[PDB]
Design a binder for this molecule. Structure first.
Ligand SMILES: Cc1cc(OCC(=O)O)cc(C)c1Cc1ccc(O)c(C(C)C)c1
Length: 267
């Protein structure tokens, strides 16, 4: 390019975001920051789930990993604001909010657990070996496992542990969420092509943002893509388990928003 342009790009090889992509990045980043219930201190801040909760799984589940009702109830108590914030996030992306209402609902149902799991995982704390839920509750593996998630707990913890070394910033988290959200791997969508074009736009912007960041761990982009796949697997395991739960447990134990968002892979 021009002489100044060349000087500035001297140590970039790879494609940077275009100005249009920078706008997309800026909007998504701010959408995430404003909805992630995370200030400046998120660690020193809030609270561990008491040690004596989550050690007593006694409700049966088909896979043999029983549920501790007390821990389950502690989790459902905080889950409604977590779900709500995912919706708040999505509503702030123009490519999402311009979709038919019915498509918006399908996309939210499709990715809600994926995004919640990512948000918990990025708050993994190696020192205490905890995840943080709804931005306030720190939990141990056993507590989250016994409190209803079973093997899904192990999967989120393993993701959180592995993500520590990626040093993701708010933008990278936000773009991961946008890619999870704008997926056509759901049934009943009207605007399939538009949603796919949006996902393609986010993916390319995200790849370019990763180039911009110059991470010092190698193969960063495909490594991050593999984590997207892990999150989708977490979402699928959760969907299967949630069906089970509803078979096992009375409806009064499930907040209405919790029931609504995790509808339909059988119930
Ligand atoms: C309750 C909780 C909230 C959390 O929020 C993440 C975010 O808002 O930052 C993210 C995680 C993964 C869950 C744990 C959870 C997620 C799904 C689910 O069905 C259950 C039942 C056992 C009540 C628990």
């Amino acid at each position: 390019g021009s002489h100044m342009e060349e000087m500035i790009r001297s140590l970039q090889q790879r494609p940077e975001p275009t100005p249009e992509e920078w706008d997309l990045i800026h909007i998504a980043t701010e959408a995430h920051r404003s909805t992630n219930a995370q200030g400046s201190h998120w660690k020193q801040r809030r609270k561990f789930l008491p040690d004596d909760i989550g050690q007593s799984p006694i409700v049966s589940m088909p896979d043999g990993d029983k549920v501790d009702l007390e821990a389950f109830s502690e989790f459902t108590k905080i889950i409604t604001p977590a779900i709500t914030r995912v919706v708040d996030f999505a509503k702030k992306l123009p490519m999402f909010s311009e979709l038919p209402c019915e498509d918006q609902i399908i996309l939210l149902k499709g990715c809600c657990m994926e995004i919640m799991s990512l948000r918990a995982a990025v708050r993994y704390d190696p020192e205490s070996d905890t995840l943080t839920l709804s931005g306030e509750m720190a939990v141990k593996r056993e507590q989250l496992k016994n409190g209803g998630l079973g093997v899904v707990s192990d999967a989120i913890f393993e993701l959180g542990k592995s993500l520590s070394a990626f040093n993701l910033d708010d933008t990278e988290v936000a773009l991961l969420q946008a890619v999870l959200l704008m997926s056509t791997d759901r049934s009943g969508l009207l605007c399939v092509d538009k949603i796919e074009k949006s996902q393609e736009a986010y993916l390319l912007a995200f790849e370019h943002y990763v180039n911009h960041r110059k991470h010092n761990i190698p193969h960063f982009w495909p490594k991050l893509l593999m984590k997207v796949t892990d999150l989708r697997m977490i979402g699928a395991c959760h969907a299967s388990r949630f069906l089970h739960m509803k078979v096992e447990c009375p409806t009064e134990l499930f907040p209405p928003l919790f029931l609504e968002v995790f509808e339909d892979q059988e119930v």
